[PDB]
Design a protein around this ligand. Sequence first.
Ligand SMILES: Nc1ncnc2c1ccn2[C@@H]1O[C@H](CO)[C@@H](O)[C@H]1O
Ligand SMILES: Nc1ncnc2c1ccn2[C@@H]1O[C@H](CO)[C@@H](O)[C@H]1O
Ligand SMILES: Nc1ncnc2c1ccn2[C@@H]1O[C@H](CO)[C@@H](O)[C@H]1O
Lengths: 283, 283, 283
Amino acid sequence: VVANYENASMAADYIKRVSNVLPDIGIICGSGLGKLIEEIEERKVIPYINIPNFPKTTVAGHVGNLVLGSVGGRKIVAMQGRLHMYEGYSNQEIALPIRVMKLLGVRVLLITNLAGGINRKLKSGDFVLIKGHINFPGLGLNNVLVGPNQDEFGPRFPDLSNAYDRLLQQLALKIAQENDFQDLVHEGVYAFNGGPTYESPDESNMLLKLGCDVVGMSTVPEVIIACHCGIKVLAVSLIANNSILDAENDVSINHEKVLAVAEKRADLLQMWFKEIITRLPLD
Amino acid sequence: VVANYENASMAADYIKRVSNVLPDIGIICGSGLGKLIEEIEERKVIPYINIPNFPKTTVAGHVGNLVLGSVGGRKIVAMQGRLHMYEGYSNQEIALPIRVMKLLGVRVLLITNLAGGINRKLKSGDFVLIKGHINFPGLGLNNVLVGPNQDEFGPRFPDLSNAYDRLLQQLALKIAQENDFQDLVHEGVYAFNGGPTYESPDESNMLLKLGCDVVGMSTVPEVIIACHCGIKVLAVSLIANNSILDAENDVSINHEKVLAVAEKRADLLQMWFKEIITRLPLD
Amino acid sequence: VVANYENASMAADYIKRVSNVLPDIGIICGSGLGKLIEEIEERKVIPYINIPNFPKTTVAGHVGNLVLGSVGGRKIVAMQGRLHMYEGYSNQEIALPIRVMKLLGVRVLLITNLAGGINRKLKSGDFVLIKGHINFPGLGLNNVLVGPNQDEFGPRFPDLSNAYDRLLQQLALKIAQENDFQDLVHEGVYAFNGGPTYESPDESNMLLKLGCDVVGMSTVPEVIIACHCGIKVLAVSLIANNSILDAENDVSINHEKVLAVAEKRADLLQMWFKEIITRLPLD
Ligand SMILES: Nc1ncnc2c1ccn2[C@@H]1O[C@H](CO)[C@@H](O)[C@H]1O
Ligand SMILES: Nc1ncnc2c1ccn2[C@@H]1O[C@H](CO)[C@@H](O)[C@H]1O
Ligand SMILES: Nc1ncnc2c1ccn2[C@@H]1O[C@H](CO)[C@@H](O)[C@H]1O
């Protein structure tokens, strides 16, 4: 399936009919997150299997439901699990859900993920506001946009220099200062590693040389598709482990540890995002 | 379609029949260039659509015609637009036109492109004689030569250490000194980014750390196919923008700005290449 | 063909039936190596063409036979040539022979390859015990494990921090000290370049900046598949050339020089590996 205007519209119209929601804000829940979903008011749950051409989640900690409803007076659509390129899906399959969000009316997209810390300061449980990225697949001819351009969504050559909206980062940090957890909040550059192997110790050391603060296997594809069709983005990494110090201590990383960190910070991440949604500009 | 001896020969024989030219020199015009095409004497224009298995150009500023004729007493074949891997074409489709040039008799290939400047010295309108490259797709398993080797054209494992002919660079610079525009001429390393997104600010900063002087989305595939079958290469980047200073000033890049820079320098680039063609060694 | 439990079992059962060997140790011979094959006692030779779904070797210096027998009292299975991703094979085709080894009973895998030296100290004929790697295809979405996970062999997200067993490296170096060729033995980080072009001079210079000691076009795929299914690995590079000093001297590299270096060191590499096999722990 191609992520074109026609197929995106078919999916959006199904969602519109079954949920009756026209959302302004979209949300993506990373590995093991999805406690925000219990706070949605007047909610409607739509399994991905019922949506025309929507792919199935295959990773632990990614529930395949779309949830719509009200949060902080605003209407939202939330992905309770995301798709990843290491699963074997094509760039058209990864791009489709974001283009459905565009046609539903989404103007601001709030993204979460779990990631490894590269910067030596970062420890398990910390948050990183993403301010830029290094797209290793994109440099090496696996960019999500390789192929015919879908002109109804955006330009052949998008500029990514404001992909991570500056005012949204400032707002997120202001709310953290207001509630006295600004000591958990950093800003940083996100490296996209295709995966599914964790970074080797020498790959982590290289990323540190190159100026990356965190590394993970998601997010950059969706961010580029959002930027291409004019959707503003805020992206936050929850740090699962520090890869540099782990390698020095011969400490292993595994997906069970990742899911446990997500469970320990999910309530706070839910509160933070609810307040950001509430304070977003009405335009 | 496979870029093998049989399919390359079919295309070359069509061209030979319709144009009656046996060219020694090949030319590739980058984005928005193609004013050299009006200086071709006794010219023959062949649309790509008429040539067996030739792909169609889909990018603005790339006209899909092959032009043959005389320049400076020598016989040439010029591509009035080029194919790019971000368009969705396979490595066999990108390689085919160069192997057609080989069978037509081409021994020297002169390449142009539009690119972003990484080196802080470079500004819009400058020229960079390419002296080497960093092939990010090739490092990451998307090299143009991955696949069965076509033995009639070259070796399984080509050496690229003289891919950019030293004496051609020296000749190009000598003519620029002769005509007092050597202050516009630099030498540099070209980074191949698959595209189609422009480099993010943090990707540009990384390229600067790694020793690259310019970055673009073309050229390295054709250069490797030429080197594989023994064709000498000169490659020149026309700088569209400086990506490092742009990111610092929050200045955006777009394809319209790219095409305008190409139009402002096209007459000089045409004069330069005509003189290089005229001065090339008769062997 | 998919490298799943069923297809791996079919191949393993054929081998078991025709050879009658249940091997504990697996071996892979790199370009132009394969003199260890004459030292196998009570040996059985099985051409790859007879094994269900085994691919054919297409590179010079890679004989397509599996050899089983006794060495140093232990039972082994040796690949007399290996498959490479630059040949055009899929990640399922490259992974299959390692998963066959797993089902045959292999617990320790000893790997050889020919490579370019990056570290300025390394010269033709030297050996490098590999202690880590930088997987450029893996960073850029061409990891050997992209796709559905084959759960019978290992986890969705493998940790690679002990992929190169520390005690095996120590044992290999101890035997070299015992026999007074420790001056030929180094330790280093291996960069995986997809190929098939040799590294350009500027790519070699970049690898040196990034902390790599050697570069080649193999090994990292098999190492990840082995680590995924719990097989311990020792990997040794035989240095064919120093790419940094070659570029400075305008000295070319070619596959004939590679094969000649392999022939000059094959007897010593055979003796070394026989002694390592003999001294391996019985668990
Ligand atoms: N240290 C790391 N390096 C890379 N990716 C990481 C981590 C930790 C978590 N993740 C993300 O979570 C999943 C793998 O556990 C994957 O979906 C992945 O994106
Ligand atoms: N700053 C840049 N970074 C990368 N590529 C660039 C530029 C500027 C121009 N190009 C080349 O021109 C087309 C995109 O405008 C593409 O064909 C591309 O090759
Ligand atoms: N200098 C180098 N850089 C990269 N690869 C190299 C070398 C030298 C040898 N090889 C390996 O041998 C084959 C190419 O000759 C290939 O199979 C390749 O793995």
